[PDB]
């Protein structure tokens, strides 16, 4: 088996995957059980038909995951359950790779444990682990879209390149230079989609009936009638008495899942019985946190600030590089209006000197990131970046976790 | 001012103004009347409050309301004693190691399964069934010294600002609606309010 | 003409793979030399005026 | 018709060497930051563009207009961002001037003959009584 499986562990919802697909699979990462004891795994929560009174657990937290047992379990489901995922079929995978994505800022006793868990029980050959981070500089090996917006305006890796991640958990931003990132001027912004969530409750409590406990509405509304705002806060104040967005509370008499609705459109006129939020001004005041935290009176800094600062831990030569080519990476990102409006700020900041450009990945960013990996795999890089069973088995794990893919050594 | 004016040539201070009712005719500071880093502007109280209030939005669930000072702990390494005592805030709790699912998991995968074995009995082999059942807290990980004082130094102060706080100018407007027009502070719980409506929502509860 | 003489010089030597802002985008050194001649351009149209 | 350039949020100014003859006050020269909106940038002015600025008396959070045609600045006024820092302010705050701070631009006016007669007969300049 030549090509390896390609596995972007997500602390929402991981991608597992063959390197041949050009998509993702998609599987859950979190555990919902039922009030009355019933639970039911990861890719079943989905199905269940109260979503009102749940008991929730996430194994990966804000930093990393620590107890291996419910991620070793979903790994498994996901790698031996041919019939829930169609097309992918496997025996032991004894000759076939791994290629993973991990955090660069990973414990590395829990970096040990990850190796030791990941080569000594699944029997794998080859691995390779790396964040996401530098993955994205070969996008210069493989045709794609990527659309570069500009600032101002109204080998085959790229060594220079400079990125941020914000997914489910927490922030990431990282600086790349020769094909190896600085892990000194890495930032970390708090403000992950956990955060927005619990933004989004807040807010509603201060505006709509409580949900607290019905935190999968919550992500659902996050996802779905969210929009940064274009321009300003109060511009977009402006707007919020003529747009609007109405939710229908999920009966779990009639539908598990509701609908959002425009007055403007007729295309739904049919009348129902439950209760209606509107949302008016939430749709944009919440995305703005990310700019303005201490909307939610918080000594946070905020984004403009720790992107500004990190450039500042850069040596000057290689400061306006990493502004001139930037990608945008995570699931955060997918909320429309907000790569303008960070590319708008973080222009007005910069000097007039140098211009910045951000380059988005069409669509959300998670199944960019895969196949960007799954062509990391078919560039033949990896081959001269690989390692061996041997190398493995004739050192231990400390070695591995210390030596090659160790942070401090690349600090 | 109108020409020739009165005075009686006691006090007379031309940059203080006094006036009202007199409905206790005492300056607000007559005696001392009682009884740009952001970590300058708001004091450590009011920062550590901010603190609190950022890992209680944290938690998405009542089970690690509870949860707090453990998380707090393992992020600034304060003892749960004064987490209880100054903050002020506002098997599903232990972790994913339910027996429960554990069986329940195998009707998951019950679909399609060929399993073999292929293992030994080693010390990376104990290693490895101690990980399956880890049972294993964050303040387990920071107190025991599996991890190097240097990852814990590089891990801590990587993220965290230390000179510029803030390079955006705020908005500071009203904590209950948004009305950007004639904000104001209140009388007594000194939070800003806009509207009517605002002041009678906040006066009750917040105020 | 004494900048003249250097940016025309800088534009003979570099002009075809330097010119595009791709290449600018994407530099160590030839990012370089595009700032150096629009600096000298601008600079001399300051001088002008 | 006439080329001019102009510069155009002020980020921060220092005044200022040793004297070293017969200069009781020595003042060098006097940087200044505009922010702007298209990218920010500082430079080195005149003494006598700060004299001025002085009469202008403008604070160090506000948006001022400078010709260096002629060297003198006009004050904009405050900076729009910079509200709500009092619950009440007479100045109006004026959003942020749009562009590049270093704006090159020509004009283009139509006058008579008769205007420069009327100019030159009854000039409008002068301080004194
Ligand atoms: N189109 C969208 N609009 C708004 N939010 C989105 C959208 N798509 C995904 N998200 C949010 O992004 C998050 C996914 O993060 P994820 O990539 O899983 O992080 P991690 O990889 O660390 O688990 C989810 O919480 C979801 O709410
Ligand atoms: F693991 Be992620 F995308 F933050
Ligand atoms: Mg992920
Ligand atoms: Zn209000
Ligand atoms: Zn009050």
């Given at each position: 088996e030549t090509p390896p499986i390609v596995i972007d562990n997500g602390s929402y919802e991981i991608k597992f995957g063959p390197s041949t697909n050009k998509k993702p699979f998609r599987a859950l990462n979190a555990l919902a059980k039922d009030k009355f004891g019933t639970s039911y795994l990861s890719n079943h929560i989905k199905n269940i038909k109260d979503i009102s009174s749940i008991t929730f657990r996430r194994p990966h937290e804000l930093g990393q995951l620590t107890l291996w047992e419910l991620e070793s379990c979903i790994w498994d489901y996901c790698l031996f359950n041919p019939s829930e995922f169609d097309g992918f079929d496997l025996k032991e995978g004894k000759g076939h790779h791994l290629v993973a994505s991990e955090s660069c800022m990973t414990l590395p006793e829990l970096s040990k444990h990850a190796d030791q868990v990941i080569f000594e029980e699944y029997e794998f050959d080859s691995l390779f682990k790396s964040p996401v981070a530098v993955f994205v500089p070969f996008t210069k090996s493989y045709k794609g879209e990527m659309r570069t917006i500009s600032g101002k305006d109204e080998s085959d890796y790229h060594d220079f390149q400079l990125v941020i991640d914000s997914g489910f958990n927490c922030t990431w931003i990282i600086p790349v230079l020769k094909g190896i990132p600085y892990y000194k001027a890495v930032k970390k912004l708090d403000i992950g989609g956990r955060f927005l969530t619990g933004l989004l409750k807040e807010t509603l409590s201060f505006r709509h009936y409580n949900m607290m406990d019905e935190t999968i509405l919550v992500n659902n509304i996050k996802e779905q009638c969210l929009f940064v705002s274009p321009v300003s806060y109060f511009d977009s104040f402006k707007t919020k008495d003529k747009h609007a967005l109405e939710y229908v509370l999920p009966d779990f008499?009639?539908?598990?899942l509701g609908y959002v609705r425009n007055p403007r459109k007729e295309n739904v006129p049919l009348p129902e019985d439950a209760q209606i939020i509107t949302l008016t001004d939430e749709l944009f005041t919440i995305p703005e946190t990310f700019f303005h935290p201490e909307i939610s009176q918080i000594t946070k800094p905020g984004i403009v600030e720790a992107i500004l600062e990190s450039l500042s831990m850069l040596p000057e030569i290689v400061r306006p590089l990493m502004v001139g080519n930037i990608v945008c990476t995570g699931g955060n990102f997918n909320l429309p209006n907000f790569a303008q409006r960070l590319a708008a700020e973080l222009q007005r900041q910069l000097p007039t000197d140098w211009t910045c450009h951000v380059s988005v990945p069409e669509g959300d960013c998670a199944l960019f990131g895969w196949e960007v990996m799954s062509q990391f795999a078919k560039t033949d890089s990896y081959r001269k970046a690989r390692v061996t069973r041997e190398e493995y088995y004739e050192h231990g794990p400390d070695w591995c976790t210390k030596h090659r893919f160790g942070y401090q050594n690349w600090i | 001012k109108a020409l020739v004016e009165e005075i009686?040539?006691?006090?007379?201070?031309?940059?203080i103004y006094f006036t009202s009712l007199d409905p206790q005719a005492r300056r607000y500071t007559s005696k001392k009347i009682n009884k740009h880093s952001f970590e300058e502007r708001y004091t450590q109280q009011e920062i550590l409050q901010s603190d609190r209030r950022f890992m209680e939005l944290n938690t998405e669930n009542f089970s690690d309301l509870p949860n707090v000072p453990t998380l707090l702990s393992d992020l600034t390494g304060v003892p749960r004693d004064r987490i209880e005592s100054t903050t002020k805030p506002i098997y599903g709790h232990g972790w994913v190691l339910k027996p429960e699912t554990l069986r329940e998991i195998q009707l998951s995968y019950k679909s399609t399964k060929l399993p073999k074995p292929k293992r030994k009995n080693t010390n990376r082999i104990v290693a490895l069934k101690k990980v399956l059942s880890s049972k294993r807290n964050l303040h387990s990980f920071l107190d025991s010294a599996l991890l190097n004082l240097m990852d814990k130094n590089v891990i801590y102060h990587n993220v965290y600002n230390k000179r510029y706080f803030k390079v955006l100018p705020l908005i500071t407007t009203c904590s209950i609606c948004g009305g950007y027009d004639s904000i104001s502070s209140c009388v007594n719980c000194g939070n800003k309010i806009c509207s009517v409506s605002c002041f009678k929502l906040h006066n009750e509860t917040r105020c | 003409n004494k900048l003249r003489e250097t940016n025309k010089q800088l534009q003979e030597e570099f002009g075809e793979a330097s010119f595009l802002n791709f290449q600018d985008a994407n530099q160590y050194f030839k990012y370089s030399n595009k700032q150096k001649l629009e600096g000298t351009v601008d600079m001399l149209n300051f001088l002008k005026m | 018709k006439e080329t001019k350039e102009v510069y155009e949020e002020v980020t921060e100014l220092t005044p200022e060497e040793n004297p070293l003859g017969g200069y009781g006050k020595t003042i060098s020269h006097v940087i200044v930051g505009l922010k702007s909106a298209k990218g920010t940038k500082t430079l080195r002015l005149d003494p006598t563009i700060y004299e001025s600025i002085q009469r202008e008396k403008v604070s160090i959070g506000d948006v001022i207009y400078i010709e260096a045609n002629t060297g003198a600045v006009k004050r904009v006024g405050r900076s729009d961002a910079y509200a709500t820092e009092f619950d009440l302010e007479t100045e109006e705050y004026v959003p942020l001037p749009k562009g590049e701070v270093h704006k090159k631009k020509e004009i283009v006016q139509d006058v008579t003959l008769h205007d420069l007669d009327v100019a030159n007969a009854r000039p409008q300049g002068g301080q004194d009584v």
């Open positions: 008499q009639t539908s598990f | 009686d040539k006691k006090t007379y201070n031309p940059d | - | -």
